[model samples]
Target: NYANAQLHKSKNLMYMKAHENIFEIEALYPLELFERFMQSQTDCSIDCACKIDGDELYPARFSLALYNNQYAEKQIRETIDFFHQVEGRTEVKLNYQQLQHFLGADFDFSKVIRNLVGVDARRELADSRVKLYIWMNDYPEKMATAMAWCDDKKELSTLIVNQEFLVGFDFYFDGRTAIELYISLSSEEFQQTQVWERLAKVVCAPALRLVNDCQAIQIGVSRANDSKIMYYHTLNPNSFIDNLGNEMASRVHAYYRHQPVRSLVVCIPEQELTARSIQRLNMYYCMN
Candidate 1:
């Protein structure tokens, strides 16, 4: 490793409109159910809003302009080159097929995703919006467990509620054997829930997509209470309890008073998204 690394983290920080209230997700995204994941929150509300119709998906409106600037271009190129070296695709669908575990059986290339660039040997940006799509399809598990809900439900609740916790994330197979991904946070952990909440206590539902392959979440934890969140650690839908945690996390730690909303959003540092990382993440996809 280079001793003189870089401040890639700071440079990748995304800033945008947010709320501290977690309950606003219902107001912003307007979810009627949480079957697989928060289809509206992650799929639509995050960076761009979406309109879901039965098995079909549509964009409400978008700031396509945000994904093609100089900074955005650089990161897209980095991600594309990474994909080309390991899992080169003649078209975006080809690569997506290899990682279709979370997508389930009905997943159609032409259905969920809109083209960002070229295709079939002209596939320049296959991974261009992968982060956006990933966030859309599988971000709910993070929120569910973060509020201390279990991926397996309350039969195992006490094991994970108070003292049974770790700062790190975990992984396992879904019903269809797809791999799950998520991250965890708590008072004692490095990113103390209190500290994140100290800046903003009202969690907002709508998040934004930023350039450079990074996305944003409007964060703000709970009040003086001891917060312990053991997120589901998987991006796939483990909230199979049918909105048990999604709506519950919305209900319990749900709303707030006046919500100014500005506690410095948290994001995975944007750097070169390595193919090895993708490979590790989707190894289950490749297998299933």
Candidate 2:
């Protein structure tokens, strides 16, 4: 297989607007049933470890760190803060909380994160009964374990924390060789969630295709078994197809966060995507 690339530069970032608060996903999760589920203050830190092996090559480990909804002044600092925030919580606890927040009563925060780090424990659980359940049912058992009350978002989160099992893995799957992609938008640099909604309704929802749109920055393929290890980057929306190797890093961590079986091949076509931009996308492995 061959890898193609694209790149873009922007003084700003792109975003999708969603009113998660208005749109309820209670059946998938019960945010409405949780106590204090209002716009209460809580922190979110997301971590993931991805590995894709076909046969002989030992599994490669790829680690990521993320903090969703819990806002921060900067990405790196927020990541560090989340790590300290969940010092005692297990990965299952952390991830479930993130799910709670994501499928929350509102959408004041960013969409699900793909990489950054709170997941050492999730890697361990991946091979356990939870993995079996997800494989068989496309959902997690802890998903049901989430406690609920009319106002207990925090309390329910706490209960989920207490009830969930913690399984730490001895080896993190290595995706170091996997390509990295990212897009960063300081809350100020990008538009408000409202804009994301507009884009979704107007440009992205029906008319625009994600992987097939000719205008997409760069697109590629992903193998289900190894998709988590790969990544995608952001491009200059005004001229996404103009370049082929120069792209800003993308925070499209959902490539791992959602854990699709098909691997994703990010296509960045801009020849201008710089070395440094590429470097940022691939920078996470140093910590481990």
Candidate 3:
């Protein structure tokens, strides 16, 4: 009864019934022919056209399946927003187990970073020093400042914050010293102002207060799919060492050298790192 009821739900049943004799030939025909027959019978398929490690991972059809079923665009948007909201702070000591609990078992933290954020974000994540911190309440102000920075790029570059703003930086790149600032911008605001300009103002102001303390400061911009971050890099090698200290400075130097930093592998031996910190470093290395 169930089979008959299901068959009756579609008009294709009548067509199939009329071609019953032809359908029987599928079993005896060549495999290729049978496949051609199968293709003619339905409109649904997967999208397995995905690449990883210079090779194809899923077929076009399977990728389609992921988009239609497993992947939720809304959920992805929410995750991105959450990530931007709490930019640099994720690094400091936090309860991973507890955060994991809050995120729920289904939450894909790695996926959020891997698939959602851009390559630069992933690279930054791979780097141990670059940290992010954000508060939802302060998001508006931070984003406004980020927009202002974009508008006043050259002007801001000449300035550094006079006082420590809400955000901070703790990362380094090759030939460039990057310091994180507490700023963000919406898609609309992003278009209006000189964000880089505003960032320069912050940098030149006392925010970092490192002009005389470091060698040279320059701009570093990394763009994600949904977020764009601005950072200041220390250009002078000697000055960078002086500002970051020997331990972190060395580690920062090592990271830009294309070294395979293993997870939990301490780059800085003298400085004792916690299991959580080690794991954090591991996550970045393991993913990329």
Angstrom error at residue 57, model 2: 13
TM-score of 1: 0.20
Q: Tell me the lDDT of candidate 3.
A: 0.27
Predicted candidate 3 versus true structure: per-residue lDDT over 8-127, tens digit per residue: 224222322222232232222122221232233222121111112112111110100111212343433443343333342444221223223323446432222112111112223233
lDDT head-to-head 1 vs 3, winner:
3
RMSD of each: 21.4, 20.9, 21.0
Error of 1 at 231 (Å): 12
| Model 3 misplaced regions, further than 4 Å | 1-201, 205-230, 233-243, 260-288
Q: What is the TM-score of each candidate against the true structure?
A: 0.20, 0.19, 0.21
lDDT of 2 by residue, 150-242 (tens): 212222122121222221112122211111111222223223455334333422222223322231221111121111111222232223222
Which of the two, 1 or 2, has more TM-score?
1
Q: Indicate the worst ten consecutive residues by lDDT in candidate 2.
A: 8-17
Error of 2 at 42 (Å): 11
Error of 2 at 186 (Å): 22
